[PDB]
Design an enzyme around this catalytic site. Structure first.
Site, PDB file in Angstrom:
ATOM      1  N   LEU A 186       0.866  -1.160   0.000  1.00  0.00           N
ATOM      2  CA  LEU A 186       0.000   0.000   0.000  1.00  0.00           C
ATOM      3  C   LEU A 186       0.908   1.216   0.000  1.00  0.00           C
ATOM      4  O   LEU A 186       1.602   1.457   0.997  1.00  0.00           O
ATOM      5  CB  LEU A 186      -0.894   0.010   1.227  1.00  0.00           C
ATOM      6  CG  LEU A 186      -1.912   1.141   1.475  1.00  0.00           C
ATOM      7  CD1 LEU A 186      -2.776   1.513   0.283  1.00  0.00           C
ATOM      8  CD2 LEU A 186      -2.813   0.748   2.651  1.00  0.00           C
ATOM      9  N   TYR A 187       0.907   1.985  -1.095  1.00  0.00           N
ATOM     10  CA  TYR A 187       1.827   3.125  -1.234  1.00  0.00           C
ATOM     11  C   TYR A 187       1.169   4.276  -1.996  1.00  0.00           C
ATOM     12  O   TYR A 187       0.452   4.025  -2.983  1.00  0.00           O
ATOM     13  CB  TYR A 187       3.138   2.680  -1.947  1.00  0.00           C
ATOM     14  CG  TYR A 187       4.004   1.716  -1.117  1.00  0.00           C
ATOM     15  CD1 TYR A 187       5.019   2.203  -0.287  1.00  0.00           C
ATOM     16  CD2 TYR A 187       3.785   0.339  -1.125  1.00  0.00           C
ATOM     17  CE1 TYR A 187       5.802   1.353   0.486  1.00  0.00           C
ATOM     18  CE2 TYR A 187       4.577  -0.531  -0.340  1.00  0.00           C
ATOM     19  CZ  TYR A 187       5.577  -0.003   0.459  1.00  0.00           C
ATOM     20  OH  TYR A 187       6.376  -0.808   1.250  1.00  0.00           O
ATOM     21  N   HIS A 191      -2.162  11.483   3.641  1.00  0.00           N
ATOM     22  CA  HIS A 191      -2.950  12.188   4.649  1.00  0.00           C
ATOM     23  C   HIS A 191      -4.228  12.799   4.068  1.00  0.00           C
ATOM     24  O   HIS A 191      -4.721  13.792   4.570  1.00  0.00           O
ATOM     25  CB  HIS A 191      -2.098  13.278   5.298  1.00  0.00           C
ATOM     26  CG  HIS A 191      -2.409  13.532   6.743  1.00  0.00           C
ATOM     27  ND1 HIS A 191      -3.555  14.164   7.157  1.00  0.00           N
ATOM     28  CD2 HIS A 191      -1.701  13.264   7.870  1.00  0.00           C
ATOM     29  CE1 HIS A 191      -3.550  14.266   8.476  1.00  0.00           C
ATOM     30  NE2 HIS A 191      -2.436  13.726   8.932  1.00  0.00           N
ATOM     31  N   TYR A 249      -2.048   1.903   9.990  1.00  0.00           N
ATOM     32  CA  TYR A 249      -2.629   0.576  10.188  1.00  0.00           C
ATOM     33  C   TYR A 249      -3.344   0.429  11.511  1.00  0.00           C
ATOM     34  O   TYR A 249      -4.482  -0.023  11.522  1.00  0.00           O
ATOM     35  CB  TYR A 249      -1.610  -0.556  10.010  1.00  0.00           C
ATOM     36  CG  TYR A 249      -1.169  -0.713   8.591  1.00  0.00           C
ATOM     37  CD1 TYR A 249      -2.105  -0.916   7.581  1.00  0.00           C
ATOM     38  CD2 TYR A 249       0.179  -0.654   8.245  1.00  0.00           C
ATOM     39  CE1 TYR A 249      -1.725  -1.049   6.269  1.00  0.00           C
ATOM     40  CE2 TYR A 249       0.572  -0.786   6.924  1.00  0.00           C
ATOM     41  CZ  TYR A 249      -0.389  -0.992   5.944  1.00  0.00           C
ATOM     42  OH  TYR A 249      -0.008  -1.152   4.620  1.00  0.00           O
TER      43      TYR A 249
END
Ligand SMILES: CC(=O)SCCNC(=O)CCNC(=O)[C@H](O)C(C)(C)COP(=O)(O)OP(=O)(O)OC[C@H]1O[C@@H](n2cnc3c(N)ncnc32)[C@H](O)[C@@H]1OP(=O)(O)O
Ligand SMILES: CC(=O)SCCNC(=O)CCNC(=O)[C@H](O)C(C)(C)COP(=O)(O)OP(=O)(O)OC[C@H]1O[C@@H](n2cnc3c(N)ncnc32)[C@H](O)[C@@H]1OP(=O)(O)O
Ligand SMILES: [Cl-]
Ligand SMILES: [Cl-]
Ligand code: NI
Lengths: 159, 159
Positions: free
Chosen positions: A92-93, A100, A138
């Site tokens: 996840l990138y 944000h 997370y």
């Protein structure tokens, strides 16, 4: 800023690699060296490997590979790996400038929606212990630490 | 990542303008148009104006102009304007990739330290109402809304 989430296709390959590179340099600035990252990008995010993964996702097999597109431009991605009724959040990138803004949360919700469609009730991941950006996101989203492996934390979420 | 805070000097001019440009494009992506920003950068952040401001700061008059330097590279700046015993926070901007690391807080604390040395007990600013990034940072750091002017909020902090 309109964001679309859809499965990646082979045409997404070249900008996928650039997002990965740009997110990696940023994310691990205090963790790995410039070369470690350039090698990681060259070896794990190679054209061939990603293509095969994008294909396995498109073919609806053991990969789920989604991108977030801002005005048609890829700016983030999530990739899960399915074995039986369980998933691992491989990647996840986002482009650092796109963090944000709830876009990560949006990719996660999409994957979760598909996992629920598939009967997948457990999801787990490995996060580098010094990656506070990722680790904090997370646990803010229902992941709990259950173990460690080397420098990484193994986190897990149940549905 | 070592961060140094010091007064800007004329040699900081060219990278100052680039930080400003890069922070501006990011900060106001949903607020102003690409051209509005390119004109703002050209007209308000011109070489001449900034030079004069950098000089007035270096000469210890009505400007305080500090930069944050990461490994010798300018990545952020704060600029205050003093009239009598009061200040206005004219500018505070970082390269987007350097946000959310307490660097903004660090520039503010430095300015506050100098204001206290100078007997300045009130500080105020104008923030665009849709700039949640900036507005939230300010209220998280003791600024309170006291009025509005056009699209901006007038916020103020006392010591
Ligand atoms: C299994 C793996 O793939 S591990 C690798 C995980 N990915 C990375 O670390 C890459 C770098 N970071 C990112 O790409 C993104 O921040 C993600 C994907 C981790 C999160 O997605 P975003 O859309 O940025 O997060 P979202 O807006 O939903 O949530 C915000 C929260 O995430 C974290 N976060 C997101 N962006 C930032 C940032 N720029 N700086 C610090 N923390 C951040 C914070 O905890 C934030 O909470 P806060 O509001 O209390 O500060
Ligand atoms: C008078 C004027 O100059 S108005 C213009 C103000 N400047 C800008 O808006 C330019 C864009 N933003 C920035 O340059 C910086 O975010 C600043 C200067 C506003 C704040 O400095 P930073 O070092 O980024 O903030 P710092 O790490 O001290 O504080 C974090 C808080 O700031 C805000 N913030 C900082 N970075 C981000 C980001 N990338 N996304 C969203 N919010 C952010 C959040 O409220 C954050 O709180 P959280 O942890 O609850 O999410
Ligand atoms: Cl990580
Ligand atoms: Cl503003
Ligand atoms: Ni935050």
């Amino acid at each position: 800023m309109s964001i679309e989430i859809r499965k990646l296709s082979i045409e997404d390959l070249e900008t996928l690699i650039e997002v990965a590179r740009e997110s990696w340099k940023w994310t691990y600035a205090g963790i790995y060296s410039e070369e470690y990252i350039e090698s990681w990008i060259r070896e794990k995010y190679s054209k061939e490997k990603l293509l095969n993964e994008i294909v396995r996702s498109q073919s609806n097999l053991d990969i789920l590979f989604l991108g977030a597109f801002a005005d048609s431009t890829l700016i983030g991605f999530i990739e899960l790996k399915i074995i039986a009724n369980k998933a691992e959040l491989l990647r996840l990138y986002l482009k650092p400038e796109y963090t944000h803004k709830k876009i990560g949360k949006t990719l996660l919700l999409e994957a979760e929606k598909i996992m629920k469609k598939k009967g997948i009730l457990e999801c787990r991941l490995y996060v580098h212990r010094q990656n506070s950006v990722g680790f904090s996101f997370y646990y803010k989203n229902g992941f709990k630490v259950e173990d460690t492996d080397g420098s990484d934390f193994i986190m897990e979420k149940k549905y």
